[PDB]
Design a protein. Structure first.
Lengths: 237, 237
């Protein structure tokens, strides 16, 4: 049992994608998670994009958990250097049919009022109280307070290549971030037991958010574009 | 305490390096692990390059194991496509003062007669009986029969960037292989307890080998050049 899909680009109204909130697909075929007006990213924005069909990460009958690999490219343009860009984007796995959570530093995946479990890889650009220096890659399990963190220098407006791989046998989740224009490579990994955190079926996708109004800083924003995305999951039973 | 060294280039008569067997440094300052004459790689060649000073990966007094990160660039040119290039190169950690092992598929790190422990990351180009398709990256522990394997397409003559990171707290060894000219990224990781496999002090370096004469194939060869190499390790206490 191996499921998989590929998006070399995104078309308007893909029957395979479920867009929520501010998420939208541009004319250029790019998935814009957060609002961008007349070429300018806006604040107080939150958006998600989930693969329409649910994927089975583990089977309770056999006890087997799936191994998977996903690759995508994104771009984050920060037009306004000061006071501070925000907030970042994440790739996440969550139960089916969840609704966008809180924006801001919660990226739209954490819902303080009705929390749902999730595993996510974040590309954090704003330093909240619970954060280390930014930008940083983080591995999140049921919380925005990362288990592991690693700093990286953003290629403003440049393209970033990401590879996330999960090996069920070792329970290792390793992510690689590469900025081809700079030739920089960033790596991070951690042990995560998906069977202990998530239900048998889940949704996979992205979520991002720009500055929250409470910070009263309209400049706290940036773009969160996904240029391409491939996903492959393998369940031995 | 934390050891650290960097080789942005290799200078002939490199004081901080122990070259063994066919390993030598060209005029262009590249580390040629295996024999190349008049611009042509030869068979029946084996060579290693070790950092002259030993590094302490763990301390028996505190029980602490070191975390480390090493980055290097290599190039493998395969002049003769048919019948089959061989054999590949590896980055390895072994006890101090070891001597080049068997060539061929053993890369010069495995000594059937008098075996010594070692952890190595291989870039295998020839398919031996114990191998999956080639080329492939492999994680080796005391043996050339990899614990984990992942296939990759070689950029013939191109430059390859490698990042190997070891996190003592999680015991995760993750390696990233990138071919900038192709934009391809390959990743692999596994759990390895260095404290259970290696002595407190070790040597770090590279080793490679070309086709073994027993195969009666002079075309079973390729180059194994190391363009640059940086290493950093942190042993707390
Ligand atoms: C941030 O976005 C919110 C929605 O994404 C804004 O609220 C929405 O405002 C629309 C126009 O007023 C209204 O049609 C929507 O129903 C409403 N959504 C809800 C229920 O929150 C929010 O600002 C709102 O509108 C301004 C004019 C004020 O009335 C605010 O008090 C509202 O929340 C946006 N935040 C800000 C302050 O820009
Ligand atoms: C592979 O290389 C070895 C070593 O160069 C060749 O065997 C001989 O090894 C002895 C070591 O005591 C040297 O003194 C000889 O000079 C080596 N051969 C010669 C005369 O060059 C071995 O023959 C090589 N394999 C083949 C078939 O070419
Ligand atoms: C010490 C707490 O920090 C401040 O928290 C504020 C609201 O709780 C603001 O943070 C919010 O807005 C910023 C953008 O201005 C980000 O979107 C944060 O993620 C969001 O919580 C303020 O900016 C913080 O300094
Ligand atoms: C299935 C057995 O394969 C053959 O094994 C031979 C020796 O056991 C030869 O392999 C040796 O030489 C080749 C060069 O062509 C490589 O260097 C191998 O690593 C080495 O063991 C023969 O080539 C194999 O087909
Ligand atoms: C938000 O971004 C714009 C565009 O880069 C900046 O010009 C703003 O700077 C602020 O306004 C200008 C006119 C000047 O007074 C400067 O001192 C201010 O900092 C910037 N505004 C914020 C919120 O920093
Ligand atoms: C070894 O590589 C060279 C360079 O590509 C090839 O020319 C050889 O091809 C074979 O041998 C030559 C002499 C010629 O007869 C050709 O028709 C053969 O295919 C190649 N030899 C091997 C080991 O296959
Ligand atoms: Ca944050
Ligand atoms: Ca081999
Ligand atoms: Mn964070
Ligand atoms: Mn192998």
């Amino acid at each position: 049992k191996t499921i998989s899909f590929n998006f070399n680009q995104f078309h308007q109204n893909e029957e395979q994608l479920k867009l929520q909130r501010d998420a939208r697909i541009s004319s250029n075929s790019v998935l814009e998670l957060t609002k961008v007006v007349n070429g300018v990213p806006t604040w107080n924005s939150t958006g998600r994009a989930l693969y329409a069909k649910p994927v089975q990460v583990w089977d309770s009958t056999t006890g087997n958990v799936a191994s998977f690999e996903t690759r995508f490219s994104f771009s984050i343009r920060q037009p306004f250097p000061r006071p501070h860009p925000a907030d970042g984007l994440v790739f996440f796995i969550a139960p089916p049919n969840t609704q966008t959570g809180e924006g801001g530093g919660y990226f739209g995946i954490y819902n303080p009022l009705s929390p749902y479990p999730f595993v996510a890889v974040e590309f954090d650009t704003f330093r909240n109280t619970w954060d280390p220096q930014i930008p940083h890659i983080g591995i999140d399990v049921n919380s925005v307070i990362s288990t592991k963190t690693v700093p990286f220098t953003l290629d403003n407006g440049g393209i970033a290549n990401v590879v996330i791989k999960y090996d069920a046998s070792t329970k290792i989740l390793h992510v690689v971030l590469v900025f081809p224009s700079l030739g920089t490579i960033y790596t991070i990994a951690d042990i995560v037991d998906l069977k202990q955190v998530l239900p048998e079926s889940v949704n996979v996708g992205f979520s991002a958010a720009t500055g929250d109004p409470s910070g009263k800083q309209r400049n706290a924003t940036e773009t969160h574009d996904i240029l391409s995305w491939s996903f492959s999951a393998s369940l031995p039973g």
